[PDB]
Design a binder for this molecule. Structure first.
Ligand SMILES: CC(=O)OC[C@]12CC[C@H]3[C@H](C[C@H]4O[C@]45CCCC(=O)[C@]35C)[C@]1(O)CC[C@@]2(O)[C@@](C)(O)[C@@H]1CC(C)=C(C)C(=O)O1
Length: 114
C-alpha cells in the first residue's frame, strides 16, 4: 500500500522493464501464466506466488512499490517460478536465464539509493 517513485524505481521502469520487454525471449512473461489457456493442471499447486513482467510493469506505473528492492524481488520470483515448474531441458528455462542475465547486468548499473 505505501508506494512511491524514486530514482531507482524510475530506472526499474525506464531501463530494466523497457530493455527486457524488447528481448526476443520475453513474450512468455508479458502476462500471468494462464493454467487454463496453457493446459497446466498442477501449475497453481506447485507455484504459490505467480509473477510476470506485465504485472511488474503495472505496479511500477501505479507506484505500488516503496523501493526498487521490492521490484527486484518480483523479477526474481518470476524467474524462480519458471526454473522450479519446468524441466531442465525445457527451452523456456533457457529463455528465463537469458532474460535474468540482462536483468542482473541492469541491476548492477542501477544508481545507488539516496
Ligand atoms: C505457449 C506458452 O506461452 O507456453 C508454453 C510453454 C512455454 C513456451 C514454449 C513451450 C512449448 C514449446 O512451444 C514452445 C516452442 C519453442 C519455444 C517456446 O517458447 C514454446 C512456445 C511450453 O514450454 C509448453 C509449456 C509452457 O506453457 C511452459 C509451462 O513451459 C510455461 C509457460 C509460461 C508462460 C511460463 C512463463 C513458464 O514458466 O512455463
Amino acid at each position: 500500500k505505501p508506494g512511491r517513485k524514486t530514482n531507482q524505481l524510475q530506472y526499474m521502469q525506464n531501463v530494466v522493464v523497457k530493455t527486457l520487454w524488447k528481448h526476443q525471449f520475453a513474450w512468455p512473461f508479458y502476462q500471468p501464466v494462464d493454467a487454463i489457456k496453457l493446459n497446466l493442471p498442477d501449475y497453481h499447486k506447485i507455484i504459490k506466488n505467480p509473477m510476470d513482467m506485465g504485472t511488474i510493469k503495472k505496479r511500477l506505473e501505479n507506484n505500488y512499490y516503496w523501493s526498487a528492492s521490492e521490484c527486484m524481488q518480483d523479477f526474481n520470483t518470476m524467474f524462480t517460478n519458471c526454473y522450479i515448474y519446468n524441466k531442465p531441458t525445457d527451452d523456456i528455462v533457457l529463455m528465463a536465464q537469458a532474460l535474468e542475465k540482462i536483468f542482473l547486468q541492469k541491476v548492477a548499473q542501477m544508481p545507488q539509493e539516496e
